[PDB]
């Protein structure tokens, strides 16, 4: 599952859209190791393959705070794509 960071990279590539996908990494307590954005990416792309994806156009991965269940949270989402 390839990952694109700019829409400009898909120009001239017919594709089908398969919906949103995301990956996450929590750190329960402030004491615990910080949220891993990479681990989010890899969960995103493996769940992209669950939807029979070919690639992902990455929307965002802001590292948020107000999330419940962990002190700071890495949410990282994009569109699953099927390049023809």
């Amino acid at each position: 599952v390839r990952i694109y960071t700019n829409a400009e990279e898909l120009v001239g590539k017919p594709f089908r859209d398969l919906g949103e996908v995301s990956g996450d990494s929590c750190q329960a307590s402030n004491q615990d190791s910080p949220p891993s954005i990479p681990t989010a990416r890899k969960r995103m792309q493996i769940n992209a393959s669950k939807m029979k994806a070919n690639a992902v156009l990455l929307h965002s991965c802001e590292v948020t705070s107000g999330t419940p269940g962990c002190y700071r949270q890495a949410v990282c989402i994009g569109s699953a794509l099927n390049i023809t």
Binding site: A7, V11, K13, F15, D17, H59, I77, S79
Partner: protein, 263 residues
């Protein structure tokens, strides 16, 4: 000299109108093919066999359909359906780029309008370059096979404006040529009946004048205005009154009657 009143073509045919008679006619007719141009409402075709249909054009409809399919992707309306996910849609607007919702729709509507080998070659080449097919016929085959339905294509605004302008310049000549054919079609009158002519050139109808001349409109707007004018003037109430100054039958069995207004 008689005074003849007629409310139907058959009544007038049996009335035996002669030069010098006073004629009073009311009915529904067609303005012959002034604010009503290309129509002339000082000459009314009055016939029982109104065989001329209102101007309709499958070719114009194909052009309008292509223009509509492209505009809903490059210039969406309030209600317009979006054929990608909300999130990817959402993502593209904050992106600052242009997405084609439905590449297959544009191909099929182009193939439909541009069915001849020589029609719209530049637009066809532009579509071939966006898709993954070898040539246009290969692309149309996949389109007819259904392999492109709902496929999306991303292109940068310079290509999107080149595309929007290519479509604009490919559709418009079809509409211009069809408005020529359509008005020329309306020039062939049905056999028989009457042509009621004002000697003064005054109109026999009471109809609202168009706010402007359709000849000054671009092709699609011109076609629409002409369809509206024709819808009005090809089936219009008319009142014709006056002294008969001439009457004669033309080669088509149509009786021309010249009327001079009464003070």
């Amino acid at each position: 000299a008689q005074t003849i009143e007629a409310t139907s073509v058959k009544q007038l045919a049996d009335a035996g109108v002669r030069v010098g008679d006073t004629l009073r006619i009311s009915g529904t007719g067609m303005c012959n093919i002034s604010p009503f141009l290309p129509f002339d409402c000082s000459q009314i075709i009055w016939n029982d066999a109104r065989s001329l249909p209102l101007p309709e054009s499958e070719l114009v409809n194909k052009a309008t359909a292509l223009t509509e399919a492209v505009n809903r992707q490059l210039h969406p309306k309030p209600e317009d359906e979006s054929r990608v996910s909300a999130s990817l849609r959402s993502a593209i607007q904050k992106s600052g780029m242009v997405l084609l919702d439905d590449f297959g729709d544009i191909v099929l509507k182009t193939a439909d309008l541009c069915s001849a080998k020589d029609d719209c070659v530049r637009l066809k080449n532009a579509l071939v370059n966006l898709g993954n097919s070898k040539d246009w016929d290969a692309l149309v085959k996949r389109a007819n096979a259904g392999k492109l339905d709902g496929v999306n294509v991303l292109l940068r605004p310079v290509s999107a404006e080149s595309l929007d302008n290519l479509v604009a310049t490919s559709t418009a000549p079809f509409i211009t040529h069809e408005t020529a054919r359509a008005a020329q079609s309306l020039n062939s009158p049905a056999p028989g009946g009457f042509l009621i002519v004002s000697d003064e050139g005054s109109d026999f109808v009471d109809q609202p004048w168009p706010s402007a001349s359709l000849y000054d409109y671009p092709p699609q707007e011109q076609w629409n205005a002409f369809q509206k004018l024709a819808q009005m003037l090809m089936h219009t109430p008319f009142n014709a009154e006056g002294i008969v100054t001439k009457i004669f039958t033309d080669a088509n069995g149509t009786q021309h009657i010249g009327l001079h207004p009464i003070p």
